[model samples]
Target: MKTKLNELLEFPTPFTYKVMGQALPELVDQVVEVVQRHAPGDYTPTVKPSSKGNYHSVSITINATHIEQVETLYEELGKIDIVRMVL
Candidate 1:
């Protein structure tokens, strides 16, 4: 089943994206790079590591202009070699 983002979100709003991946030093950097590429902002992402220290969860907030922008950011961030999941 496919769910469309446009039906769930409003335009020109602050959207929070959460990315999970291996606990690597570059995970946060890569995630930030993808977000800025689409929404250009001073993003301060919060990072949380799994209890076993095997994974890292990065949460960032960006001002999304439209559904496509949000969807594109998710797709691009998911494409990063080290990224495991985007929520």
Candidate 2:
């Protein structure tokens, strides 16, 4: 079953964005920099390497105030060349 964002999340709530991409040394920094453009705040990311060590999973939680903001972040992150997926 598929659930919608509006149904699962309330406005002005903290939302976590899960980003999976190439395991580059600057991937975390690049993701955080884009996030800062939308929501300016300190972000602590949890990153884990894939079993094969080819990809990295970066999880970041930010105080998102609107659905648009979250959507924009997703779109912007997807634009990154190294980003393979955004969840």
Candidate 3:
């Protein structure tokens, strides 16, 4: 038997997170690699300078096939040292 989730996961949807540090370029590159590794579907990532002018925030729109996939991505993203936080 199987149960269906009638409600969305509390996890952020089409989430946005900030990666703050000196190695912003490296972070972006790493993020690109991560995206290519897991979420191979067509998507877009916007990386730009933050208002603080020292940090870079990456907003990635991934084509998640299922709810679990989203959670997986979030977990992987959390492991990256360059990623200060994931929202």
* Candidate models: Cα lDDT each: 0.63, 0.62, 0.49
Better of 1 and 2 by lDDT: 1
Give TM-scores for every candidate, taking all chains together and pairing residue i with residue i. Answer: 0.65, 0.65, 0.50
On residues 1-87, what C-alpha lDDT tens digit does candidate 2 reach at each position?
A: 113542234345677887677665655675577567656675645778764477787786766555656666655555656646766
Tens digits of per-residue lDDT for model 3 on 1-87? 122231244342353444343335455555556555655544444666665556666665654434555545545544645545544
Which residue runs does candidate 1 get wrong by more than 4 Å? 1-11
Q: How should the candidates be ordered by lDDT, best one leading? A: 1, 2, 3
Clashing pairs for model 3 are: none
Q: Give the root-mean-square deviation of each candidate in angstroms.
A: 5.1, 5.9, 5.7
lDDT of model 1 at position 85? 73
Query: Global lDDT for candidate 2?
Result: 0.62
| Candidate 1 lDDT over residue span 5-75, tens digit each | 43234445787777667666655665578667655575645779655477777776667656667766666
Name the runs in model 3 displaced over 4 angstroms: 1-23, 42-44
